[model samples]
Target: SNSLPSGYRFNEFEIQEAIGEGGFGIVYRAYDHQLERTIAIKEYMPTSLAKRNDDLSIGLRGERFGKTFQAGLNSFIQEARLLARFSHPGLLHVLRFWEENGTAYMGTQFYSGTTLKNLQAQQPEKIDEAWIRRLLPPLFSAINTIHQEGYLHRDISLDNIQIQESQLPVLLDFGSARKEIGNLSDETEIVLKPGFAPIEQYTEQGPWTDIYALGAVLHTLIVGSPPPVSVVRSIEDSYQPLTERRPAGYSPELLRTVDRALALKPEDRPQTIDEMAELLE
Candidate 1:
């Protein structure tokens, strides 16, 4: 079955082409006839439990997936609604969203840019103090906004951040809340990114969750790869200090600050962005 027809209409928008796809959703480069502009549309179709039909209607895998599917659908909608109210340039701007057929879709402001992952690949040898300086501060400010709203960005990696003109970092993939859609089990499913996730994320999460992930992101930028998973660091502490790994370009202060943020214990890390910012300063 086709993902979404080129001319498939969703209210005022029409699908142009599928730009990206993931386990939980499909993103399309769409056109808004009403506004005469291009935008990105994300459809809430969990590929594991559902399939998109040629008719554009979604079909579920089995009765077992029904309850969990709806739970994930509701969480996706909530994420869209919360993002729509955000006015920060550092965060992805969600213009609108709605429920259609049996699932949800969100319209986001589209931009021409390169993800940090791609950008780093292009200039692998250019990792330095200036680049790190430019990257971390703005992201910290943007993250502070979400933290203030009582939310956590459970996913923060180079792939989840886009660099636009003038080197501005725009955070992406605010789908952490959707982790609530696991199964009928008593535990909520946890999303884990090997190098970026902290030990606490395996159990419960809070604002500090993002702080650890952010530190991991910095570690990746400095060393050209992520540090070992926190679980490994917890039992054996094999992860080397950031300064030791990339001692040539980065200053002692910056490396020490980032290392502190990646602390295994939540209480050991900065409790707030302001605290982290102070160390960075």
Candidate 2:
């Protein structure tokens, strides 16, 4: 049993004022007396659209849990279970989970720090090559671990990367994650953050689907925003060339690497996270 705060019953965790809120859940800093630590809790909002399966998985290629509250429960179960199986220093660690009052709760190591988005807000110029050199490797290593464990972190965005006190990067947001690859159905609605989406993300792709998004992330940190991908135009004609709009302080070599990873044709890109990792070194 984990220790909880005074005057708060077990499982209550002494909810402090809300630290952050999102469509899927609201985050709060709380004293987990049982665990004897200050941690962040993401309280699931039942029937919350943010918690909906943005999964592209469906049909034979993919299998949906179901289309009901049961489906949502199943989705939540999958996220908790998957997190239990995987652990990495650069990733958010889920310490405990249970359902209560129609809401599911997950306890994680509350990183009391700003997100990359927050840092960017305060210091846009801080996103330079030195930061990229200092920042990306460990973060990519964490992402690499997830993929190596056979899961694709389908959602990668500024909001998902945290800038902790050490000024190090931590990857967050596993809500849209999936273990298998390329099994998505024809009806799979591709969920992506625009500008960061690869040309193939709009279609049915596998682990490679995330490669482009990672490239887009690096592009964003260095350049402020990724080049727009015009899905309306043919994928062939969709993007602005990198050199034409590359980030400052980035070497042509790195840009070429990113360009290849973000190639319009998913097949043309690196097939695994390891391949991309090699380029970073």
Candidate 3:
């Protein structure tokens, strides 16, 4: 298994169980002995590139992936350091992070709730306009802080949003850490989700890149699915504007903003987060 065994201790934390597993890493609900609290500890263990050896230090599958893995590792630590500096509640708060076991580890406050992906399945009716709108303020504040620091959270799908027990949304799975890993890879890789990502992401991206994604998130919630994949629409465009569909429950102003955000051309979308926020407000 890629996870540390239960009761395994590392630094000041003891592994309880694996609570999350994904392409980027695995998150364990760990006990912080000194603080006497539960924390989520994430270990960098991309299965395609590395593995745990008998000594517990992760080694490359082979040297062919050596440079690429290190590049990603560097960015991973870089992101952890940056994330630790951010104070917004909507952001993942990193308690501490360090390099050990030939990989990086980050400890963050563990939450007691579900991700939007899970919650949506069980309570779709509850995620209405009021709920979605309520999350915008914190989400935008956190994102503005990141963009000001020259970082971007390229991943922003519903799955990457954690809905805390208090019902507040916290952004997760920042793509900044994985941004350069693929550029150095010996194999092909594109760090993107098909439906949630706009056409520009296949090439280059900017802050507006996230705007399009957020609109796609809105589309999923309102229309039951994301609009036609932006890449396909780029060539043979078939997206029906949300304004035109005018689905019942939402106001024209919000629908219009979503329509502009989902525009095929990046130039047609909101040029900045503030631009989008202004209209949504």
Candidate 4:
């Protein structure tokens, strides 16, 4: 169902099977004949929602657009724009974007990587303490780029971070990301994976949302067992400060930094990427 631009032969390329699928869209690994490179194609949802009346997800309906239906549309466009502006050694680079037949597409550098979730599951025993420490710097660098550009990566769970062939962290899934300008309600209501997101995320509490998420990731690396979805005492309500829970043998400085990031109050969290990057050195 793809309509290639003029002078481009669509049939010359072979569309492989699906690579991944989620609320954002379906991704496919396709062969681009002209470029002769294996390109990743992120195909946005089609316009059939207006015609067939098919509910994309029964329990996960899209957000209501008060002023217009462009809220969701703009979210996709904003992702393209942000990816275009931020050029970092730790983040993926956007290559191109276009629309055809009411469907939008985003093209980017193709890399072979596995989600942190998969890596953790497949090689649990093989993982070492040193590798885990190495992951934080790249993560900080990429996320710092996001904050510097006036954006917030509301979702930063293990599934969203990638471990590439070089074993560096590469952030993914900007679909749920948003601007830091206002207290806007997010479109999706998926319960974030427990232990990976802070309390503010579940409550739509603005600012410092990513801080809580960082704590969860750090915890996973330290304890080797992810934090339970529900703490019997409920850390959200009352728990030891993150600084106090630093796992043995881990850096106290690093633990304190992540602890401040998970502050219950947004104002207590680091305000800029540069502030967080300073700790990296």
Candidate 5:
């Protein structure tokens, strides 16, 4: 919860503002004087295991936390390294990563004035099936790359999708995956954004997990809210079929596709983005 203040400098990047945060890390919009540009940088600082010291260096919260802290740091750095390998229009490009200030940091290409969540609230008319159709290809392209890289984006909520200058969407925040890798032995509870998260996440996760979340995103786009919570639905599925609702401006097939993806049973859903894209068609 302790974020770097505005103009906080480390290496050549000056922190402009705290852009995002999670149980696993802290993110900031930063200015790189050396490169003469603005970028986003995330620090490997899990609140449970580490704390900001008076000297401004990160230190473990307890002496017993050494191993856990190190493991999380490794996964944090690994996430950065893996993210750097991906080159896709739908994914935020990782610029650089390094160890500094008693932890690690990854810098990425920053975009300003985007995020589908804001647009949906401010201008609901802009988000239609036509807009969704245009965005899905690039999003699918990025997710395919992520799957090939052996990663599933556990968090694909509306807020995580940003509309760029080209008016297409790009995905953001790999923190959930990083958090899972960091705390491998601890399955006592999983971080879940109830509506976007699928039932499989509370049990086992795969490509279908992400697919379900995307369905929830689509459901929200149509119904103005995400589908029923996966766990609750697992007990008694109260999900309404989108086809029944008949949200205008979308073909029946598209609504059915969303319904299929939102299916409670994993095997009942589209296993691949390619399959779902075809469903969209």
Candidate 6:
């Protein structure tokens, strides 16, 4: 019915408190006695189909949800394995992960920061090319690395990006993240964040899918709001260009470039992050 207690033990890690929760898991601020440092541990628990009984073991709702629950568990483990192999400052630093008691848990380095969404809330009208310049390059490089390794982030929103004390953007929340192509036993359902996700995201997709979302994020930075949903744009294509929407401060070229990345068709968008980077230049 609730997350594990503060002193709950998992291997060498000791849970401190619940820090965050998502559709797939609950994240805890934990202490590692072996390393003498604090870290975050994500416990896989799909609320729709599972619950934490008083015994501290995960219990399923029914046999029907069992298959989907198992599928998600496998995907969580797969995400852990993939994350362990890649390392980048802009990306999450996964410490370790394992399966236990019919669920999975991933350990990652904990840090202090505010999400871009929070940052924007503080300065709604302050987002400009200067802000975009500070944010985009490192994010692009991180996305490029993940795509080159044959994975799709699938989720890239202001809320999912943390701006650490150093002013560096660190991408977070890989629960919806998955491979570029399906390789697992169960097909991960398409995850969409309205405004950020492109039309193709509802169907088949590729690396360009992420490009669309990043472009939408830029649109938010410039306009102080996310663009209309992909479905709406797909039907009417009535969204105005960024330059037209906000006529000053931003370059016409830059606005157009963001517009290009947001092209309704994936093929119409820049095929790769490098190609999109060149356009920004």
Specify the highest-TM-score model's number: 3
Which 10-residue window in model 1 sums to the lowest lDDT?
Answer: 182-191
Expressed as tens digits, the lDDT of each residue in 164-275 for candidate 4 is 8899887766643222111244423443556656655555543356766776676666666544443332454454554677666667667666666655556767655456
Return the clash pairs for model 1, or none. none
Give lDDT tens digits, candidate 1, residues 1-281.
Answer: 33787898987899999877777788888999999999989888887778876677887878788888888888887778777768898988998888886788889988667788888899777668788887778889999999998888888888779888678888867764346555332433445678898998766577778898889888888877888888888899887888676678788889988898898889999988888889977
Clashes of each: 0, 8, 0, 0, 0, 0
Look at candidate 6 and give me any clashing residue pairs.
Answer: none
lDDT of each: 0.81, 0.65, 0.82, 0.59, 0.82, 0.80
Ranking of all predicted structures according to TM-score, beginning with the best and ending with the worst? 3, 1, 6, 5, 2, 4
**TM-score of predicted structure 1:** 0.89
| Residue 4 displacement in candidate 4 (angstroms) | 15
Evaluate residue 12 in candidate 2 and report its C-alpha lDDT on the 0 to 100 scale: 45
The 10 consecutive residues of candidate 2 with the worst lDDT sum are 178-187
lDDT score for residue 244 of model 4: 76
Write one digit per residue (lDDT tens) for candidate 6, span 42-83: 888877678887688899967777767777777777777777
Assess candidate 2 and give its lDDT. Answer: 0.65
For candidate 6, report its TM-score: 0.88
Tens digit of per-residue lDDT, candidate 3, span 1-281: 68788998886789999988876688899999998999999898878789889877899998988888888888888878878878788889999888889999998988878888888888898878888788777777877777877777777888888889888878866765465676665333456777778887877688888888888888888877878877898889888888888887888888988898888788888878888889986
Per-prediction TM-score to the true structure, in the order listed: 0.89, 0.79, 0.90, 0.71, 0.86, 0.88
Q: In candidate 1, residue 63 scores what lDDT?
A: 76
In angstroms, how far off is 112's CA in candidate 1?
2.3
Report the error of model 4 at residue 81, Å.
1.9
For residue 90, model 2's alpha carbon misses the true position, in angstroms, by 1.2
